[PDB]
Design a protein around this ligand. Structure first.
Ligand SMILES: NS(=O)(=O)c1cc(C(=O)Cn2cnc3ccccc32)ccc1Cl
Ligand SMILES: [Zn+2]
Length: 257
């Protein structure tokens, strides 16, 4: 039922998923002046050398690039985290226009898109069990601005036409997610939730300060995807972002400055 339209978009989600009005929902606006520098935060450890991508899927809300997470091959740890989190998938949120599309905002600035690298805590054995825990997931969020192309994104853009509609998938091996990271790993961090239903409050968010650049042609190709299935009327997959939610009783911490 849920999606991103007038009739089933974010302002409606709370009727099926009441935690939508919960105490630690995401995304949020990152007020850079009020984020607290925490000199005890560690450098983030991103260990993606052995990543095994498997498949790319149009799930009707975004596209997911999925990884083999049955061994410690692409892991996140350090930063604010206590254990080891395994990469399971990444996906993006983007706009119908370059001036919107990100979920998190920075001093109310919206980026053109936002990449989410989703990882689950190995102490819970699998993703489905991890999402039921308050420290189950760690999502590395990276902003995209439009400018020069991101060469490491082009393999993803080029397969999109093979997964245009809801439920399509394609083999997607040997994709290296290191090609999507900016130079700096400086970040903000706070406790939050999935940004899509079921909106579970299981995520440590780690949002990088430095955006990556992608070209206008690369983001245009995202906008040609479809939320509908094949043989259904065409609804362009655009504006699949949830707006900023109340910060409530939380403090955003900065690893820098
Ligand atoms: N947007 S996000 O908070 O990074 C996040 C998003 C998701 C998904 O959207 C995964 N996902 C894959 N098929 C789906 C069908 C309905 C809802 C979610 C679905 C799963 C985990 C995380 Cl952490
Ligand atoms: Zn997401």
């Amino acid at each position: 039922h849920w999606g991103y339209g007038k009739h089933n978009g974010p302002e409606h989600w709370h009727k099926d998923f009441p935690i939508a009005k919960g105490e630690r929902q995401s995304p949020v606006d990152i007020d850079t002046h009020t984020a607290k520098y925490d000199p005890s935060l560690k450098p983030l450890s991103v260990s993606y050398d052995q990543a095994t991508s498997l498949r790319i899927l149009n799930n009707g809300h975004a596209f997911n690039v999925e990884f083999d997470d049955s061994q410690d091959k692409a892991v996140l740890k350090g930063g604010p985290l206590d254990g080891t989190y395994r990469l399971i998938q990444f996906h993006f949120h983007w706009g119908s226009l370059d001036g919107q599309g990100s979920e998190h905002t920075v001093d109310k600035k919206k980026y053109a898109a936002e990449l989410h690298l989703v990882h689950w805590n190995t102490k819970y054995g699998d993703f489905g069990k991890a999402v039921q825990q308050p420290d189950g997931l760690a999502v590395l969020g990276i902003f995209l601005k439009v400018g020069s192309a991101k060469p490491g994104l082009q393999k993803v853009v080029d397969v999109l036409d093979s997964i245009k509609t809801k439920g399509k998938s394609a083999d997607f091996t040997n994709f290296d997610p290191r090609g999507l990271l900016p130079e700096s790993l400086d970040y903000w961090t706070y406790p939050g939730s999935l940004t899509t239903p079921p909106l579970l409050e299981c995520v440590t968010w780690i949002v990088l300060k430095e955006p990556i650049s992608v070209s206008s042609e690369q983001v245009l190709k995202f906008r040609k995807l479809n939320f509908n299935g094949e043989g259904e009327p065409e609804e362009l997959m655009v504006d699949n972002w949830r707006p900023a939610q109340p910060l409530k009783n939380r403090q955003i911490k900065a690893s820098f400055k």
